[PDB]
Ligand binder design. Structure first.
Ligand SMILES: CCOc1cccc(CN2[C@@H](C)[C@@H](N)[C@H](c3cccc(Cl)c3F)[C@]23C(=O)Nc2cc(Cl)ccc23)c1
Length: 95
């Protein structure tokens, strides 16, 4: 476990661009837990096929909404701390 369970439950308000990404996969509301935000971003990556099927551990997000939010062309899905950092820049923490 890389991310503490307490941190996973953190209530957050996504900024407009991340909120557009979430709404595109049916996420209706304005506040979530990070766990829920991570779930929906998971659905987004799977729905848009943002990976090589032979090498599924790397997400490629260049020229996509996700890369505009994250500020990277790609990233490893193993590095959870860096993924949390990139998500934190696109939201306001509530609690
Ligand atoms: C058939 C294709 O399958 C996939 C291909 C690539 C990615 C995924 C979705 N992944 C899985 C690999 C989870 N282990 C990974 C994950 C889960 C919890 C926390 C973090 Cl920090 C985390 F990274 C997660 C997820 O569930 N949400 C999410 C959001 C982002 Cl932005 C990046 C990665 C992920 C599925």
């Amino acid at each position: 476990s890389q991310i503490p369970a307490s941190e996973q439950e953190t209530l957050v308000r996504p900024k407009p661009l991340l909120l557009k990404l979430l709404k595109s996969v049916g996420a209706q509301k304005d506040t979530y837990t990070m766990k829920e935000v991570l779930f929906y971003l998971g659905q987004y990556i799977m729905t848009k096929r943002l990976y090589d099927e032979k090498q599924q551990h790397i997400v490629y997000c260049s020229n996509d909404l996700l890369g505009d939010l994250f500020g990277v062309p790609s990233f490893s899905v193993k590095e959870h701390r860096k993924i949390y950092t990139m998500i934190y820049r696109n939201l306001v923490v509530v609690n």
